[PDB]
Design a binder for this molecule. Structure first.
Ligand SMILES: C[C@]12CC[C@H]3[C@@H](CCC4=CC(=O)CC[C@@]43C)[C@@H]1CC[C@@H]2O
Lengths: 10, 242
């Protein structure tokens, strides 16, 4: 989930 | 020129690796720093990609996928450009604090791959590639690798890719020779990225035996996404037949 977390955090 | 305005406006600035240049070069130190640099650059690549014209037309799943497949090519291409503009391709300018001379190319155990990246850097000079050509080409790299079985909404991707190709053609607009040359250069990035993906995958698997540190996102992406590429489930889109 680390990439997704970055992507959604902008 | 709206499209070029945007590409210039969103282009990431300088990213440092955090490498300790006071310590002697070692395989583990150089690779750990490259890995950290990848982690740092990933943040910039995401912010950049999400701000590209039309990027939000894609299904969100596909937005995340194309970044996770294309990052190596994007980063290598940008690094080749930095190397060209900063040191006339005499060295690989990974970052201001991580510049590879031949000794580091050897010590990284990636000499063959570094050779190919330096060759790519030289092409920017040999072809007299303009900053505006570079920007358009780099944007197109984001849309140059997809699953063989297709994306969540392939139609939206196809349309977006088509438009980035058109934008590259208009910045070119001898024109046929130029477009052939630039598409050949673009194609050349992909086999280099593949070799680097193989190298980094193998390194991750044995990382605990060679004291190489992989940050969180790099380890995830290299174990979850990169194997799709290496196993042939995700493949580059080539302009020309290889
Ligand atoms: C993946 C990798 C770390 C990240 C590197 C990559 C080489 C290409 C590269 C160029 C950059 O400018 C950012 C870091 C990256 C993206 C390295 C090859 C082996 C190492 O594990």
């Amino acid at each position: 989930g680390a990439f997704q977390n970055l992507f959604q955090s902008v | 020129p709206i499209f070029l305005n945007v590409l210039e406006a969103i282009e990431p600035g300088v990213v440092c690796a955090g490498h300790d240049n006071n310590q002697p070069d070692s395989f583990a130190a150089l690779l750990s720093s490259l890995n950290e640099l990848g982690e740092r650059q990933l943040v910039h690549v995401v912010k950049w990609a999400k701000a590209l014209p039309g990027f939000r037309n894609l299904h969100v799943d596909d937005q995340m996928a194309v970044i996770q497949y294309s990052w190596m090519g994007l980063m290598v291409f940008a690094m080749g450009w930095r190397s060209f503009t900063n040191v006339n391709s005499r060295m690989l300018y990974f970052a201001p604090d991580l510049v590879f001379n031949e000794y580091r190319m050897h010590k990284s155990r990636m000499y063959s791959q570094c050779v190919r990246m330096r060759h790519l850097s030289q092409e920017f000079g040999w072809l007299q590639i303009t900053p505006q050509e570079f920007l358009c080409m780099k944007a197109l790299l984001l849309f140059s690798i997809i699953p063989v079985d297709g994306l969540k909404n392939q139609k939206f991707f196809d349309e977006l890719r088509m438009n980035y190709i058109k934008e590259l053609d208009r910045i070119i607009a001898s024109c046929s020779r130029r477009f052939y040359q630039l598409t050949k250069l673009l194609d050349s990035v992909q086999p280099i990225a593949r070799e680097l993906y193989q190298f980094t995958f193998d390194l991750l698997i044995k990382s605990h035996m060679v004291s190489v540190d992989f940050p969180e996102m790099m380890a995830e992406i290299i174990s979850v996404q990169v194997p799709k590429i290496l196993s042939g489930k995700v493949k580059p889109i080539y302009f020309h037949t290889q």
